[PDB]
Amino acid sequence: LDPGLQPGQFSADEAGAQLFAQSYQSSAEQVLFQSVAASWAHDTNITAENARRQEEAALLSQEFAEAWGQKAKELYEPIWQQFTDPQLRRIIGAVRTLGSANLPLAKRQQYNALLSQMSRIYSTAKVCLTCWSLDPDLTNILASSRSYAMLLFAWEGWHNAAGIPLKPLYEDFTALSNEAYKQDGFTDTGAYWRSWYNSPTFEDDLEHLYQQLEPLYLNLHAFVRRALHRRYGDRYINLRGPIPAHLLGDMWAQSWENIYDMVVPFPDKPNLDVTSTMLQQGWQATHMFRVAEEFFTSLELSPMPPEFWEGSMLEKPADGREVVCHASAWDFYNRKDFRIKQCTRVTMDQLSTVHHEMGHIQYYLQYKDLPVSLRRGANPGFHEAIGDVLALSVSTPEHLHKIGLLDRVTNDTESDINYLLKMALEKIAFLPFGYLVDQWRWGVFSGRTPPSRYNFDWWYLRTKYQGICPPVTRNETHFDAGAKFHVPNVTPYIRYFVSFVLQFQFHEALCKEAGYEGPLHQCDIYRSTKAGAKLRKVLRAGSSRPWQEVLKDMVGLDALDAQPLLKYFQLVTQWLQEQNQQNGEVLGWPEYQWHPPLPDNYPE
Ligand SMILES: *[C@@H]1O[C@H](CO[C@@H]2O[C@@H](C)[C@@H](O)[C@@H](O)[C@@H]2O)[C@@H](O[C@@H]2O[C@H](CO)[C@@H](O)[C@H](O)[C@H]2NC(C)=O)[C@H](O)[C@H]1NC(C)=O
Ligand SMILES: *[C@@H]1O[C@H](CO)[C@@H](O[C@@H]2O[C@H](CO)[C@@H](O)[C@H](O)[C@H]2NC(C)=O)[C@H](O)[C@H]1NC(C)=O
Ligand SMILES: *[C@@H]1O[C@H](CO)[C@@H](O[C@@H]2O[C@H](CO)[C@@H](O)[C@H](O)[C@H]2NC(C)=O)[C@H](O)[C@H]1NC(C)=O
Numbered sequence: 001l002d003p004g005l006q007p008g009q010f011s012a013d014e015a016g017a018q019l020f021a022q023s024y025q026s027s028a029e030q031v032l033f034q035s036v037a038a039s040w041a042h043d044t045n046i047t048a049e050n051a052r053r054q055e056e057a058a059l060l061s062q063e064f065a066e067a068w069g070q071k072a073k074e075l076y077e078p079i080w081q082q083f084t085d086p087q088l089r090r091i092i093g094a095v096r097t098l099g100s101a102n103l104p105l106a107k108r109q110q111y112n113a114l115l116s117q118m119s120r121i122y123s124t125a126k127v128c129l130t131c132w133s134l135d136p137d138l139t140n141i142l143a144s145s146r147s148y149a150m151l152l153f154a155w156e157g158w159h160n161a162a163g164i165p166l167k168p169l170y171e172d173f174t175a176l177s178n179e180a181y182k183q184d185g186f187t188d189t190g191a192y193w194r195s196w197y198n199s200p201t202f203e204d205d206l207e208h209l210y211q212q213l214e215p216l217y218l219n220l221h222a223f224v225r226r227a228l229h230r231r232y233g234d235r236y237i238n239l240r241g242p243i244p245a246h247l248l249g250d251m252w253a254q255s256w257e258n259i260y261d262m263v264v265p266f267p268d269k270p271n272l273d274v275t276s277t278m279l280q281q282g283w284q285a286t287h288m289f290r291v292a293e294e295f296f297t298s299l300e301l302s303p304m305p306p307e308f309w310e311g312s313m314l315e316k317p318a319d320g321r322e323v324v325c326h327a328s329a330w331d332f333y334n335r336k337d338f339r340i341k342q343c344t345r346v347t348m349d350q351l352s353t354v355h356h357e358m359g360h361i362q363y364y365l366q367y368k369d370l371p372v373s374l375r376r377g378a379n380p381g382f383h384e385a386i387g388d389v390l391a392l393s394v395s396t397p398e399h400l401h402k403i404g405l406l407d408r409v410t411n412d413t414e415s416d417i418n419y420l421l422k423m424a425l426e427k428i429a430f431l432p433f434g435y436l437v438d439q440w441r442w443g444v445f446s447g448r449t450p451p452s453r454y455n456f457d458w459w460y461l462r463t464k465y466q467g468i469c470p471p472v473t474r475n476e477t478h479f480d481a482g483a484k485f486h487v488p489n490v491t492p493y494i495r496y497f498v499s500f501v502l503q504f505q506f507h508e509a510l511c512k513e514a515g516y517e518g519p520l521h522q523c524d525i526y527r528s529t530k531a532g533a534k535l536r537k538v539l540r541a542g543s544s545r546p547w548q549e550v551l552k553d554m555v556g557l558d559a560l561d562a563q564p565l566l567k568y569f570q571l572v573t574q575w576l577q578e579q580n581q582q583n584g585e586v587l588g589w590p591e592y593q594w595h596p597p598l599p600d601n602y603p604e
């Protein structure tokens with residue numbers, strides 16, 4: 001570690017800790033920068049030289065975290081928890097967590113190589129027949145092929161190309177992760193991730209939430225299954241069984257918006273898939289990011305700075321570079337550079353993604369004057385919900401009309417149901433998956449799920465929550481969890497399930513704040529500076545206050561709550577139950593063992 005980046009000595013008291021924290025922040029910004037830059041260079045231009053550079057930068061981070069973490073312990077272990085400055089408690093608390101820096105050198109190099117190589121496998125896997133990439137080629141197939149056999153080729157190809165080679169690396173990764181966090185005092189890496197919510201009842205609270213939401217997911221499931229049955233027939237849909245995992249518009253069956261055309265109940269109302277309008281009108285990526293930006297500035301939030309437009313990668317390069325396509329928002333920790341990396345496609349759901357990713361940028365912008373340690377969401381769930389809150393306003397028919405993507409606007413119940421159904425395909429269908437992914441990973445980290453049951457336990461969770469089955473047999477050579485980006489990327493997932501509930505809480509608060517008197521699902525906070533002021537206060541707090549306190553200031557409750565989500569969807573909940581009863585459906589999948597046959601001359 002460079003001389004200038006090493007800690008000195010401070011007094012062993014709170015006064016000295018302030019100075020410690022100041023000097024830490026200078027050094028950290030410089031180290032975070034060099035690291036975020038090296039990853040950027042990699043993720044936008046995947047080569048061996050850039051990977052070796054990222055690994056060297058991660059190593060420098062680890063030396064840093066170690067020298068400053070050791071020093072925080074040496075000076076402040078007795079006293080940091082009694083400090084008067086709440087923000088300084090959190091900072092020192094962060095600084096003393098070594099994570100992977102607890103590893104000895106050879107194991108840090110191994111850990112870093114594993115992250116690098118899993119990233120590269122996930123992001124450069126192709127399916128050949130001439131080779132298709134996940135984005136855009138396989139995404140597109142899943143979204144709008146309706147050939148059972150072609151969807152299967154893509155689903156299986158993908159899960160095979162990405163899963164199988166990840167498994168040896170994922171096992172090694174898990175061992176090293178656990179080893180590292182055990183020396184911070186955690187029983188496993190999972191306990192560490194769960195500790196961010198700083199809630200003794202965390203697992204219980206989530207299950208109380210999921211139990212309240214499960215009826216909606218079940219009603220929707222049964223409805224969609226019936227729709228699928230009408231198209232794909234009795235051979236490939238069991239009305240009493242899980243849905244084949246490849247028929248729902250998305251590689252992970254995590255969002256079902258792309259099958260909207262098979263379920264929409266009132267096809268004579270305004271068509272709420274504006275994708276073809278966007279294509280007809282000649283939208284490009286730039287436009288999408290501009291329209292998101294303008295939403296933000298209508299709230300008196302900050303615009304994207306020059307550095308964002310000059311630095312971002314908002315399109316897949318055509319120059320034959322390998323990139324990580326999976327959309328992400330980047331803070332370089334220099335208070336100046338913020339960028340999005342996205343292989344933006346021109347569709348309505350990518351319009352949401354854009355807003356999602358811009359939510360992150362906006363958070364980065366508001367809290368950039370906090371100490372580096374506090375430059376994060378009140379919890380990771382907060383960070384994920386910001387863009388999604390705006391996107392709820394954007395998707396409303398009124399707002400789509402105002403940005404010229406919907407030629408007229410109805411305000412009738414048939415339209416409301418169309419709308420709420422679409423939103424349910426996006427939001428309610430995701431709920432089981434948001435919950436299940438980290439359940440799988442907590443199991444793996446704790447040792448409940450060894451390598452020999454990685455795929456067994458994954459599909460148990462898939463069937464249990466989502467009510468889907470693999471469309472071909474899987475076994476333990478397969479590693480289907482690893483064909484989902486967040487797993488090889490080591491990005492926690494429970495934040496999304498938290499986000500998907502929190503976003504309706506935020507929505508309801510901002511709408512009330514904006515003066516909006518009508519049904520929640522027709523609220524548009526566009527141009528509400530009051531709503532903006534309320535959101536800004538949250539963004540600016542970063543992680544400097546307990547999320548339960550920030551939440552209470554914002555929505556009046558100190559806890560995640562399903563009521564807003566439920567009142568948002570209330571009308572389509574009542575509608576779906578009526579339909580499912582009149583069609584004599586079975587809620588759930590009592591024929592849990594059922595799997596569909598192979599197509600006749602498959603794999604051809
Ligand atoms: C795991 O399954 C793979 C995939 O094979 C297909 O799906 C299986 C579950 C099986 O039920 C069959 O429907 C299919 O073969 C098996 O892989 C291939 O199977 C044969 C026999 O080895 C052969 O054509 C290939 O070489 C196999 N290898 C691969 C991965 O392409 C595999 O043998 C199964 N068992 C184990 C322990 O991995
Ligand atoms: C992608 O990454 C490679 C490095 O992996 C970059 O290539 C180097 O670029 C400098 C300046 O252009 C040359 O002098 C070196 O000789 C190159 N090294 C290698 C290993 O080729 C390349 O510039 C990057 N490409 C893009 C489009 O950013
Ligand atoms: C669509 O019509 C409904 C029903 O008339 C509107 O909802 C009412 O809105 C007013 C003020 O805007 C409130 O005072 C009422 O309490 C609401 N009543 C009901 C029955 O919900 C709604 O605002 C209109 N929506 C749009 C798209 O603007």
Ligand SMILES: C[C@H](N[C@@H](CCc1ccccc1)C(=O)O)C(=O)N1CCC[C@H]1C(=O)O
Pocket residue numbers: 326327328329353356357360384489491496
């Ligand atoms: C598109 C988005 N990308 C992630 C990227 C996360 C990430 C973190 C750290 C490093 C790289 C990428 C993000 O939340 O922005 C994402 O994965 N999202 C959006 C909501 C649900 C979730 C999903 O698609 O699984």
Ligand SMILES: [Cl-]
Pocket residue numbers: 193196380381492493494495
């Ligand atoms: Cl999380």
Ligand SMILES: [Zn+2]
Pocket residue numbers: 356357360383384
């Ligand atoms: Zn996100």
